[PDB]
Amino acid sequence: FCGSAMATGKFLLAYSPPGAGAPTTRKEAMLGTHVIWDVGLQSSCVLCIPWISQTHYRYV
Amino acid sequence: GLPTLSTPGSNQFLTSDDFQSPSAMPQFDVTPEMDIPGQVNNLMEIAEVDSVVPVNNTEGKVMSIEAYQIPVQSNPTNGSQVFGFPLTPGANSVLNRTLLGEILNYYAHWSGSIKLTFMFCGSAMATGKFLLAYSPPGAGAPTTRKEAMLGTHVIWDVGLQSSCVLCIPWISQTHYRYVVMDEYTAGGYITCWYQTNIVVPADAQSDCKILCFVSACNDFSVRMLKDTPFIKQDNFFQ
Amino acid sequence: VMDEYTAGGYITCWYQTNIVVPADAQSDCKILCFVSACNDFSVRMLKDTPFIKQDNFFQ
Amino acid sequence: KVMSIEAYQIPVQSNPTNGSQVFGFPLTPGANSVLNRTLLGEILNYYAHWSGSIKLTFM
Amino acid sequence: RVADTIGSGPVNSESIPALTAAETGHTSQVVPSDTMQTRHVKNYHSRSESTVENFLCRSACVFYTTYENHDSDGDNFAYWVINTRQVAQLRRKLEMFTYARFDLELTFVITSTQEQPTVRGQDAPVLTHQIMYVPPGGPVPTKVNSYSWQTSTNPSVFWTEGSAPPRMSVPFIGIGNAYSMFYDGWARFDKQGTYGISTLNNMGTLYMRHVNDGGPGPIVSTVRIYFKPKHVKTWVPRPPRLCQYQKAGNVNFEPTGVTEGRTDITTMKTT
Amino acid sequence: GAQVSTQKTGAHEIHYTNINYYKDAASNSANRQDFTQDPGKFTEPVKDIMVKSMPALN
Amino acid sequence: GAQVSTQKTGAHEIHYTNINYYKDAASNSANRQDFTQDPGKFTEPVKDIMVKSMPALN
Amino acid sequence: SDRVRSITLGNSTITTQECANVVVGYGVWPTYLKDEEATAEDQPTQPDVATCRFYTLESVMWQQSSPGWWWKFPDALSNMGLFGQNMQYHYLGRAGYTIHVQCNASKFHQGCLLVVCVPEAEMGCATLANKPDPKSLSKGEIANMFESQNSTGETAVQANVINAGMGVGVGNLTIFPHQWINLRTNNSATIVMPYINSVPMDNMFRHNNFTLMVIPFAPLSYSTGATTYVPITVTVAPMCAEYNGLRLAGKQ
Amino acid sequence: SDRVRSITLGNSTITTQECANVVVGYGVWPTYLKDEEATAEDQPTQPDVATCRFYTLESVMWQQSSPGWWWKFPDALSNMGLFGQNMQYHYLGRAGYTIHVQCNASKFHQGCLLVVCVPEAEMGCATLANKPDPKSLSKGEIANMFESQNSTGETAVQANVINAGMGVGVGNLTIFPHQWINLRTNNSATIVMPYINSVPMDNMFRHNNFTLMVIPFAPLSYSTGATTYVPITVTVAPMCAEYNGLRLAGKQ
């Protein structure tokens, strides 16, 4: 986050495996893999995207 | 005299009291006990015995041995309902008059699993598979086999063993249900459906009867004695 | 019950300095105050509360 | 203010004077309106005598 | 028993007992010694009387009703469907807790009075009453002499006037693991129907009558019923009822002020 | 099977005796002598303890 | 827990037995047998003793 | 460190930059039902990671006039993914929850919320002779609101905040598990609620159990220029959810 | 932790949110008079908790033009409760003090005060051939003020700050026990002063001992909108006060 020290905010970062569509609302995204980032001293936050595939390898 | 102080309760006559009392016949020599077969110690020994349930208690059938006979026959359709009644053993007409129901009626609360046994009285040449089910409350009663099937069920296949048991587990939020019928204490629905059909060869009846019995399982118990609403009287019999 | 014999004193609060605030910040604030007993507290003599009346059985 | 969440809010603000009083109430937990309706006051009201130290927290 | 106040003296530290953060939802455990110079006091005060049991364990009238010696069919006998919500006092006490488990000690105070159409040579033999408890489902009486008064199974007390309040003890007869004083729910899964504490209420009915049949002069008797919780266990304390009660079967209330008011935040004049 | 307990006596300066006569525990007198006490449930339900002399918010 | 004491008998020529039945010491009978006695508090509060056979004022 | 915080349930993590502690139930942490406490005999389903995760409800905006809001659990979660689907197919169920209420402001903003979980919050009707209706009681994942004046309605809940809809001093809601969000110090409140009820398990549609109430005791306030849009979001996670009595789905 | 602070004397506690350390006298902490150092033979009174507690003097407002203020001890305390009553009834007395000067501002405010305790601060008259008068020297619990120009007066104290009323560089007041209150970092100053004098005890009316001086070296400053009312409060506590030579009360 590159705001200013006086700004605050909470974001919801999410990953949604395929199969259903892409989430079009926060209620849809939230039902999948998510982290709730709260802006504060730690400018940065990590969303780690797990490997969830039926294969082992995906094609590039 | 030993200084004493009487407390509330003195001189009342409580019907369920338990005190000693003088015997009007001092030194009366009773007649020696014998040893009669069939001693009973707990009403539950009686409620644990199968009694024939009058499932077919419709209108005019209620004064006929017919009240006891569930009709079953060959049909041109699939998954038809054979019968259905609620798990309200204390108050429902289907169950309340059986040995189990009569005993429940001398009490206010009950708890336990119940066994329903179905005995097929077709002929040795008839066959068929039925789906017996129990559905806890909350959603409605199942109106189709696909609905019933999603709950507790057994698939009875008619063959050498005429009879089959649907055991109804105790699934309640309470511990005890009232024998009295409360929506809070709703117990679910028991229903039966054709899994296949009654197939029979030519020269054999396609119409058959099925008898159904009830009794308590080993976890059953009743609590709170009360008089039954089943026996009235206008004045002393003579 | 409130007796002059049993008077317990006075609790008061005063500004020691002042509420100083920068421009663009409200100067009006609220303060909440809570109560509870310490570990030496005890009550004696049960009686009914004067806080709940009734004219006749509720139905 | 007694029928408003406002009954609970002590006002405090920047002032042009020194040492002004913010509030004041007597230590009569059982009978004074300020304290008698709190958890502590309600319990005191089921009794006739009390004794102990009391904690007032200001947030 | 309560805590001794331990003597303390001057301080000049960087430990700050007086400063906390109530946001945590945690009550400060401060004591005088933390903010002032204390002397030592050996405290002998005991909290014996605030034990939940001593608080609830005192007989309280929960109801009363009347019936008449003679006069026919409503009048003749009375009945009450047991519940603890028709009286303010007890009800507010039990209600300081969400769930409770306890035994009960019932005591009955029965008194009789003469009514005006008097008659001469009125000299009535002593009166004996009968109280019968009818568990949910039991056949209930319809007139002073219905068969149900034979009580072959329901318990009943027969008591004669002038002889000391009849009394019994009843166990925790609940069907759940505790009696619920509140129930934010419905009786039916579809939410149609009743809502609230009444959905749980099914403790039976009491029935009373005179035993000696009606004499010349009319007599009215009142039965006062007392409840005394015993062997009490209580969970989840709640705020005491503020608003007065309106109905016996629910929590319905008329909004009401948080306290009495005073002129300013500065008034020491206790109301 | 008589039980001898202690009377509420007072503090800066004796026993009773009870025999139960009924078959049911519900018939027994009150438990007026149970002095268990644990405020912690309601006064300090905080997961991270909270020391008094310490800075509440670190 | 029965207590056996002595009855007031008389002097120139026997026991009782009591069991307390209530949980509160206030319910107990009277202390009619306490014979402590100390006049000195009121009869001789003088700091410098005062012997009888002696000259009171020296 | 220690004002910061991270909670992972299922495939969801919550992080906080400035919290207090985490208030825990009545000191009790949630746990599955024990054989000694059980009565329903069928083997329970304990989905786990699919049901005990963080569900984020609709947000709400705090304004300088808001009297407060409230939500009823399990109701609020009846439509959230598999937790909701399990509620439908089962007669019985039980669960605990970790409730995390979020609300960031600025340093120039001020205000303070009470965040409480009131077990068994039976509510009064606005009109004395009626019972409130299902929807006045709970609008699902949508917060209902208290009012700063006597509500009138023929079947509405008497929502005047001062009596918290229950006929008690709102200021005493404190004996229930709670935290405060004083913008000056906090920005979230986290409360873990164990399952509290007078029965081991219960139907999740006909009984509510506990109500979350968020009530501002010191109003949102700020100088002109400061952002006026201050939402309050509520994320909740069932904990140790088990169900019993499987059958077809629905209410009825 | 450690910028926070709590001091309890008697029935009074002081807390600070942002301090420095606590400056202690000349490293000496106050203590009662020793038999080897004593000369007055009568048994002293050592009231304790009733006299060695925190007395809060009148507040003063810091403005962008204030040159400084000063108070003289014991004088400033001659009317404070029992400490003052003991001063009246006794010929002799001695004590140490914990001085806590308070002043909070905002983050947008700026300024810096010197807080010094000058032992034996004999002051000069504005007019060379006279002696200042009692009141120009000390107005009791009411601060006297320095001026930013030569004072004139026929019996006034030459209060031009630059010479601190003593004929020395105000900038060298530093060899005396002191602290600074730089609003940017501080908000209070705490100084413990041991009893310093050339005699074991002394009369508390005819001798002043030490003078507290608060002098802004960087002026209060702020942008428009910021609060302009910035008071400076002074709370003091006698420590180890003993008195000797009891008789009737007064001066004379």
Ligand SMILES: CCCCCCCCCCCCC/C=C/[C@@H](O)[C@H](N)CO
């Ligand atoms: C011969 C006389 C026998 C009398 C028997 C009386 C039995 C009734 C005992 C009732 C105890 C009820 C207290 C109230 C509980 C309710 O608050 C709750 N709604 C139930 O969960």
